[PDB]
Write a protein that binds this ligand. Structure first.
Ligand SMILES: Nc1ncnc2c1ncn2[C@@H]1O[C@H](COP(=O)(O)OP(=O)(O)OP(O)(O)=S)[C@@H](O)[C@H]1O
Ligand SMILES: Nc1ncnc2c1ncn2[C@@H]1O[C@H](COP(=O)(O)OP(=O)(O)OP(O)(O)=S)[C@@H](O)[C@H]1O
Ligand SMILES: [Mg+2]
Lengths: 467, 468
């Protein structure tokens, strides 16, 4: 069960899935009975998105074509649609006024988490801090249904990209696949491209200077195509001049906000690294989900980029913390490099990104610290950390001198000599520290039993309300 | 024979299953065709010069293209410094250049441009009569079979981009490229065209378009950008989306053509078929057009760039009007062709009637036996004495009529009948046309042909194809 195996399997399942906008009067049994005539159905679910929608995952890829064969084109008076045929369908009843199976009803798989004000009560009603964090983790994490929906979005963009580039693939990365994803987070997608006789035979293709110019031209054209031809695509925004060129859009059927970029093979290795750490111990994920929520409540993070610390930066700080335990909760990257082999030996653009993929090759942690300790110690550790003189190196798992002058310096573990938190200024760092120290204080000085009895917030709940 | 539409469909189908291969410097024809034959049967092929030897290959089967593509790789210059759009443009090089092991036979190069005027004049002087001069010109200038395949292929390559999101699209050529009056070196005018199970009514989700002009502009804009950036070989891509008929101009380096891509001129296609019929009816028709069009170019009456000049197309219609006014007429009128049409040939587009026969046998041949010697001189005489102030040219009736609007030269658009196809022409350019017509008539009347032949001087067509 390696990261890459899972990706391939998830993509193959997304390959043979479809989305159906369901009728207002919905008969589950009749719908599945009909669709079963096109082939076996491995899995399905329903979700709410300006009407009831259904994801259908067939056992066979041929069932998609079968269904497409009996699907027609919409036909209006103005009658002007872009006739791109996808795997987005709309089912309506032939005779709507002759059907009265109104009270089914249908199980709706949620795609967003409960808001904080609903979550706080549940945390107060828990037994310990450790449980508060796991409750949060469970309300927030990606469900199996949401994950299928994400890979499908990639798959739909793949087919759309395959109009001009038939050998293309679109693989997700970042929070969507590194185990640290929460409901409502964006889908980060990257576009990838993959002898008898006397002649070497090649295509004629325009020779541009660098990857960068091609990348920009491709994304620009795909962008325009999504905007003008793509069904359910919207708010298309081209950001082709960033360090990593990128196109943003919202996909109405799945409801996701999406980021399409090209060939970032580094970010994939990073996604696998965080995948490993997330799989090694359940405390890792529990801790990240809570601290990331904490940062949002106190305005340390923000939706728009700027001087704020990013979830990703924060996540790496949390990993560094976990590397510095006695004994360490997770191994260092260098430790993972020494356990790698030739199969796991990836070198990309000069940098070494090699590390083990097999989980059993990693010796489990002897550490038995509870989350009560780890949460408070996180605030204590970074509330007393010397950010002027020290930087966070996740390869060595040690504090080291800063290569460059920067308020918060965190070492990019692959593209070394980059600071993943270069964007952070001193005002935002000082606010992080102040909130850390205040949160530590609250957790230390709180009389938990007294707060429970008084029907007041305590533990995680106390640090997840504004000060 | 066959009908205009049948030919188009057949030509496009053949272009559908053709490819262009940039050949090695050391070219072994036999070995190349032997290898390509392993991917399927080859109906036709030829070679042409264009910054190196290129080859058009027309397979019998469309599957042979995919077969060939399957064994074709990516160049890999810098490890993704190319745009990986895969087309039907290939580059063949030798695996081991040091293993050539056969005798070097040279290769037949099919020309794609005609000889220049200064080379043509001698050939015309050495001919027997004026009639022959015109047929010699016609033969040096007309489209070859190879050039025609190359034109339809260019359309086919442009089609492939458009079908990415409009799968039922066609890019069909029109104008001189297909109306029999095309000459080597003329541009390619292209237009883009778009044409009970269960208890559930099942439909695709598909993005709505805006109304025709805005869609057209968005589509051409995107195809334009694709030609420019996904390539290969497109160049000088120029978007002119705000014209009365939105349009994208470009030059295609592999085929060597200058191209005009627009959307849905179904009228201009009917016009192209009309001229096709006239061109097929009698060989004198084409002979006359090719000579007069050449005449106009030599005397600066026409020009490459649009403006106040008479256009080849306008001139061509004037020539058709002339031929309608013969005794007996050399070609039938459009109304005559409308009366011979049936339901199959009954085309009505945007309010206007564009119906006319497609079958050639339904048209009775012409009794007219006038030679080209007469027709050429009579053309100059007729229009040199024509009253352009009081008369307009109506090709439907085949008659001179009053001008609906005030315009120096008024020629009736035979389909969109509110319109003057030569509205662009001012009085200075019309007066120059008339002056050149009258002077050309005079030269042909007063020339002593035998005296000019003996003196090694220009005569007949050659005399009117040198500047005054
Ligand atoms: N400053 C950065 N330095 C190195 N890698 C980065 C940086 N920013 C983003 N990435 C990579 O791009 C991926 C996706 O970017 P983001 O969507 O912004 O972050 P995320 O990890 O998906 O968490 P979310 O979306 O805020 S829940 C990250 O996981 C990184 O692997
Ligand atoms: N003013 C016009 N009115 C009507 N149809 C026109 C007009 N101009 C061009 N067309 C159509 O467009 C076609 C091609 O346009 P042009 O390229 O300008 O003419 P052409 O017939 O191709 O002659 P060439 O290309 O100069 S050798 C013509 O056959 C006409 O069918
Ligand atoms: Mg993300």
């Amino acid at each position: 069960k390696t990261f890459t195996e899972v990706q391939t399997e998830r993509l193959e399942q997304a390959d043979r899935s479809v989305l159906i906008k369901c009728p207002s009067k919905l008969n589950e049994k009749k719908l599945l009975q009909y669709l079963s005539s096109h082939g076996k159905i491995d899995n399905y679910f329903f979700f709410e998105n300006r009407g009831i929608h259904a994801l259908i995952e067939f056992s066979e890829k041929s069932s998609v074509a079968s269904l497409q064969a009996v699907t027609g084109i919409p036909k209006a008076a103005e009658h002007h649609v872009v006739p791109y045929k996808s795997r987005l369908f709309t089912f309506t009843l032939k005779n709507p006024g002759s059907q009265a199976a109104e009270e089914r009803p249908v199980k709706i798989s949620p795609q967003s988490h409960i808001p904080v004000n609903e979550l706080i009560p549940k945390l107060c009603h828990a037994d310990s801090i450790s449980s508060q964090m796991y409750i949060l983790l469970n309300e927030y994490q990606l469900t199996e249904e949401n994950i299928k929906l994400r890979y499908l979005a990639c798959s739909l963009v793949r087919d759309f990209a395959r109009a001009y580039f038939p050998d293309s693939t679109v693989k997700p990365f970042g929070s969507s696949v590194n185990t640290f994803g929460k409901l409502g987070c964006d889908v980060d997608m990257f576009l990838d491209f993959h002898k008898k006789g006397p002649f070497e035979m090649e295509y004629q293709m325009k020779r541009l200077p660098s990857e960068r110019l091609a990348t920009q031209k491709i994304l620009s054209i795909i962008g325009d195509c999504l905007d003008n031809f793509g069904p359910g695509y919207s708010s298309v925004q081209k950001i082709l001049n960033a360090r990593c060129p990128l196109v943003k859009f919202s996909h109405q059927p799945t409801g996701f906000q999406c980021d399409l970029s090209v060939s970032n093979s580094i970010a994939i290795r990073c996604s696998e690294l965080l995948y490993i750490y997330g799989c090694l111990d359940p405390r890792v994920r529990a801790l990240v989900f809570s601290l990331r929520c904490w940062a949002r409540v106190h305005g340390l993070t923000n939706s728009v980029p700027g001087t704020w610390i990013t979830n990703f930066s924060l996540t790496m700080m949390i990993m560094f913390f976990l590397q510095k335990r006695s004994p360490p909760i997770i191994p260092t990257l260098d430790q993972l490099k020494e356990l790698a082999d030739e199969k796991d030996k990836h070198v990309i653009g000069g940098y070494d990104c090699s590390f083990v993929s097999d989980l059993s090759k990693i010796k489990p942690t002897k550490n038995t610290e509870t989350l009560d300790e780890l949460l408070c110690d996180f605030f204590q550790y970074f509330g007393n950390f010397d950010f002027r003189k020290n930087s966070l190196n996740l390869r060595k798992g040690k504090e080291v001198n800063k290569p460059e002058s920067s308020p918060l310096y965190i070492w990019n573990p692959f593209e070394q000599d980059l600071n993943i938190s270069k964007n952070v200024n001193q005002p935002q760092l000082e606010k992080f520290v102040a909130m850390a120290r205040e949160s530590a204080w609250i957790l230390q000085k709180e009389d938990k039993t007294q707060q429970m009895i008084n029907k007041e917030p305590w533990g995680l709940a106390a640090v997840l309300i504004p000060f």
